[PDB]
């Protein structure tokens, strides 16, 4: 019984749906069990890598705080040395940030670095099984595993992923461009794809926020 998924939102008529092979981690040879459809406006966006470049700089430099300081002549018991703690925080436009994440998803899929999976459940929690399966499926040295929510993630995967430095497991809300670029291949659960699409596709329209959504 093939696992067939269709985009919940209306795909544009002039754009055909994107498709990929659904996989399962239950067995080594369970590479293909179904075929899924992906929204072209999410997984077939233009390859604008400068936005990805900007997002990476923003991600690294928005948390940057420098504590370097030097004393001037008036403070001596450097003419142009560091003066106290300095902040470099800045905010990119919300639409651009959403687009940057979209661009990253296309790059991984077009480059055969994205692996769509039905569920993360594993027959055993041994890290050896996970690494060997990655070798069998020719995955990259670093594999990123994403689940819908942190609370419900399978126990077996947590033990293996926690003990693996190059295989890192994150929740869906924790997904970011930096991790995707840092990790050679991305593993996404089917519910996560639907979760990601809704927020990205929700961005349509403006109805400018008169107040923060907190």
């Amino acid at each position: 019984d093939p696992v067939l998924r269709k985009c919940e939102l209306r795909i544009p008529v002039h754009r055909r749906p994107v498709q990929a092979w659904v996989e399962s981690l239950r067995g080594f040879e369970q590479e293909r069990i179904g075929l899924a459809e992906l929204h072209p406006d999410v997984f077939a966006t233009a390859p604008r890598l400068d936005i990805v470049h900007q997002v990476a700089i923003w991600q690294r430099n928005f948390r940057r705080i420098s504590y370097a300081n030097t004393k001037t002549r008036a403070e001596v018991s450097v003419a142009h040395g560091p003066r106290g703690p300095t902040s470099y925080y800045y905010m990119l436009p919300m639409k651009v940030r959403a687009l940057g994440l979209k661009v990253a998803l296309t790059v991984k899929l077009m480059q055969d670095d994205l692996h769509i999976v039905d569920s993360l459940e594993l027959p055993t929690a041994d890290p050896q099984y996970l690494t060997e399966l990655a070798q069998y499926r020719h995955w990259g040295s670093s594999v990123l595993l994403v689940d819908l929510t942190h609370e419900e993630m399978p126990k077996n995967v947590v033990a293996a992923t926690s003990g693996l430095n190059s295989f890192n497991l994150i929740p869906a809300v924790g997904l970011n461009v930096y991790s995707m670029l840092k990790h050679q291949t991305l593993v996404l659960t089917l519910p996560s794809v639907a979760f990601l699409e809704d927020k990205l596709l929700w961005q349509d329209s403006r109805y400018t926020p008169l107040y923060p959504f907190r």
């Binding site: 430095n165 924790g174 970011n176 930096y178 923060p212």
Partner: protein, 93 residues
């Protein structure tokens, strides 16, 4: 000048450690969290510059207001004197 006659000790850096590997996670809390928490809320550092940025004078002024009631008398007086010199340069020259 004269230079070291020996090499510095070798340094080994792990690029896949938990800190580097997981750096940036949850930076999309706003978009992926319904915007309930703004990413500026994730800034960790001095209280007077969490979610805010400005020039040194603004940073110093904000620092004074935020912890002025908790500032030492010696520190507060020194900060006031430094601010006085800074104020004249920026606001008169």
């Amino acid at each position: 000048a004269f230079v070291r006659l020996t090499l510095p000790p070798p340094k080994v850096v792990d690029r896949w450690n938990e800190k580097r590997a997981l750096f940036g996670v949850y930076d999309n809390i706003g978009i992926l969290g319904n915007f309930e928490k703004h990413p500026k809320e994730l800034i960790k550092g001095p209280v007077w510059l969490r979610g805010w940025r400005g020039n040194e004078l603004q940073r110093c002024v904000r620092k004074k207001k935020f912890v002025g009631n908790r500032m030492f008398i010696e520190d507060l007086h020194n900060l006031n004197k430094r601010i006085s010199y800074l104020y004249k340069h920026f606001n008169r020259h």
